[PDB]
Design a protein around this ligand. Structure first.
Ligand SMILES: [Ca+2]
Ligand SMILES: [Ca+2]
Ligand SMILES: [Ca+2]
Ligand SMILES: [Ca+2]
Ligand SMILES: [Ca+2]
Ligand SMILES: [Ca+2]
Ligand SMILES: [Ca+2]
Ligand SMILES: [Ca+2]
Ligand SMILES: [Ca+2]
Ligand SMILES: [Ca+2]
Ligand SMILES: [Ca+2]
Ligand SMILES: [Ca+2]
Ligand SMILES: [Ca+2]
Ligand SMILES: [Ca+2]
Ligand SMILES: [Ca+2]
Ligand SMILES: [Ca+2]
Ligand SMILES: [Ca+2]
Ligand SMILES: [Ca+2]
Lengths: 416, 416
């Protein structure tokens, strides 16, 4: 007595499903007497009281009636009178491929670190289809890209899900963004498909240490350079982004003498002077500079600062005699005083030009480069001139030249 | 005439440097006549006017006089009178190892990332010594450590500088801090040395992805669960520190039906319900959960939520008859009305118990599980009782059980 029908969905109104009168055992000679009618809350089917045919009365949407279920049957009861009996009739609703697949969003972003090795797999969102059977069985395809390919796996139930695979190492410094196109096609008839774009954003990793522009920063400055003047400026380049690009500068293997003279800026990297320079103390400074970033990548170089000599030291005069006493009966050629000169500067700034200022019965005789002797030249007499105030002047050969004077008193004593 | 002396430094006052009278060509028979005396701004040496010996007058510190210079000579002039002449005398000051080396600071920290490969080199600060020659030539030693060794290189001038080398990979999750001891010994006599501690702080890198406690979170909840109730709580463990340890939770491959029913917290990871559950619509939910951290390390699992059926649907009654008309001359056994019942619930909650309420000349006969027939049992007469109000009651076998009634009017017609 139970009878099942199998018709496709989305059939036009009035389509023939089956002759219930003949399939049960009725006859056109008794159609009006039994008065067939369908009893169901959903007016999906109707029975013609003329020939006993089962027709379609409303739109039969399998996605709205059954959803994602495999089988889809509609059970109702047909009522016949004289006598009154029940006739259970079931109608299987076949599924057609009338719904294309779809993704969650058209544009999907995916952040991938550039440290990802070749062969790394990243999960991609699958497409959904309200159909069932082969009409929902998706087949995923990816547009050709030299860096990415597609992996299509299956679950334990047979559904396919795509996964992105990396076949070439990523580099943000070469290409930070990639644009992919994923396509999903179902296995129904006709084949309906949809597309979606995948924007791969390459995340930055500290894959590049700082690099100085020069491995040696050499400069020459003056001796009396004012405190707080710019000496040079180191520069380090980092191709990364964010914390992996901020560079800090500092000194290495440095001493306290240098620490009180120079100062290196951590941010700008400009080298200045906080102390005083002196050529007579030190004429060269070899300093090492370290460059650090966020990922603790180090970069080392050397800085050499040469100092030129300036004429800032005056010539010094030293004298010595026999208690500043002279005998009036001394012969021509007798040494009376000894002159010693020296200058702390170098080059022509240290060369001293010694001479005698004023007229006196004495004469300066040069022995070596820095030694002189005050030799008598004229007459001496205590009764006439008892003392002489010899003034010695020394002058260097600098620019500007410095000088210094020193007067010594020489007494004249009686003869024997 | 020029004469040079070579004496060590830090000699006691009055030590003999040399006999200037004999080394030049004088004689004890003429010591007081010439009256020897030293002329220098620094009172480092003196000449004895008795025997003509050159002695030490003050402390001679080579580090204070010459500093870091290789050679160290002191030039002065000795003055003799009757006659007056100059005698240039130089004294070379030999260096002794009377100053130990030293570092900048006793405690030195060094941050090293755990991603450092075996053999990585890290610069260490060198020790400084105010001495010169072999007295300042340092020899660095490192205490034995299973992870670190010492590399000793030399510059172009011969000075040694240490560098730390890594022979075993570092792991912050195993040991975040290391304590090293660096020792510097000079090549003088006696050997003076100093020590310094190096605190190596292992910087954290994303070397551990999130790990779920369970690969499957299965739970069973009721059907009419109130919106906003806790379902379960996923948990992911990350052994890293900082941004590399913060975990965010989200859904993957999810649909709109699920998105309007459940909600996953990104921070706490607690799963709640924002919609309504229904067993008649869907009895199982398989959801995938993704765990992401700062370094974009992914972790996937699955969550299955089973729903139990609740008796929240009342039995439905459907009736049909011959236009609600009965002939008074009907035989015992004639079908008058057809009863159809069904319940949306499952199990014993769907089993329907149909019966007739009130005394009537009718009887309910059960055909199948859900079909009944109202069969006459007694006498009928329109002149006496023209109509009957048959009330059919259906009740399920749930807890608590539901029920529904439906009264149909049956008219009695005359005979033929
Ligand atoms: Ca459809
Ligand atoms: Ca369909
Ligand atoms: Ca489809
Ligand atoms: Ca790069
Ligand atoms: Ca960097
Ligand atoms: Ca990078
Ligand atoms: Ca100067
Ligand atoms: Ca100068
Ligand atoms: Ca000068
Ligand atoms: Ca000393
Ligand atoms: Ca010394
Ligand atoms: Ca030493
Ligand atoms: Ca670890
Ligand atoms: Ca982590
Ligand atoms: Ca770690
Ligand atoms: Ca329900
Ligand atoms: Ca229910
Ligand atoms: Ca029920």
């Amino acid at each position: 007595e139970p009878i099942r029908y199998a018709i496709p969905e989305e059939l036009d109104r009035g389509s023939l499903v089956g002759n219930l009168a003949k399939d049960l055992g009725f006859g056109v000679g008794d159609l009006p007497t039994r008065n067939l009618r369908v009893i169901a809350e959903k007016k999906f089917f109707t029975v013609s009281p003329e020939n006993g045919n089962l027709l379609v009365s409303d739109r039969i949407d399998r996605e709205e009636i059954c959803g994602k279920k495999s089988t889809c049957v509609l059970e109702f009861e047909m009522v016949a009178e004289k006598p009154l009996n029940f006739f259970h009739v079931t109608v299987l609703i076949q599924d057609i491929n009338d719904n294309p697949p779809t993704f969650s969003q058209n544009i999907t972003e995916l952040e991938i670190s550039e440290l990802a090795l070749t062969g790394a797999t990243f999960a991609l969102e699958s497409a959904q289809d309200p159909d069932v059977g082969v009409n929902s069985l998706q087949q995923y395809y990816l547009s050709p890209d030299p860096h990415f390919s597609l992996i299509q796996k299956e679950n334990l139930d047979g559904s396919r899900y795509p996964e992105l695979v990396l076949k070439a190492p990523l580099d943000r410094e070469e290409q930070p963004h990639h644009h992919l196109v994923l396509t999903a096609v179902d296995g129904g008839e006709p084949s309906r498909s949809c597309t979606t774009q995948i924007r791969v954003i390459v995340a930055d990793a500290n894959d590049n240490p700082p690099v100085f522009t020069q491995d040696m920063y050499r400069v020459n400055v003056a001796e009396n350079l004012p405190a707080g003047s710019s000496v040079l400026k180191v520069m380090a380049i980092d191709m990364d982004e964010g914390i992996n690009a901020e560079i800090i500068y500092a000194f290495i293997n440095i001493g306290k003498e240098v620490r009180q003279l120079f100062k290196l800026d951590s941010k700008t990297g400009e080298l200045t002077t906080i102390g005083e320079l002196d050529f007579e103390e030190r004429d060269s400074y070899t300093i090492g500079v370290e460059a650090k970033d966020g990922g603790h990548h180090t970069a080392y170089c050397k800085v050499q600062i040469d100092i030129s000599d300036e004429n800032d030291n005056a010539p010094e005069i030293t004298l010595a005699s026999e208690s500043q006493h002279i005998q009036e009966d001394a012969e021509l050629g007798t040494a009376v005083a000894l002159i010693k000169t020296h200058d702390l500067d170098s080059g022509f700034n240290g060369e001293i030009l010694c001479q005698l200022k004023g007229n006196f019965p004495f004469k300066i005789v040069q022995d070596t480069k820095n030694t002189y002797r005050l030799v008598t030249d004229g007459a001496l007499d205590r009764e006439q001139i008892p003392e002489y105030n010899v003034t010695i002047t020394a002058t260097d050969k600098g620019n500007p030249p410095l000088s210094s004077s020193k007067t010594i008193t020489l007494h004249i004593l009686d003869a024997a």
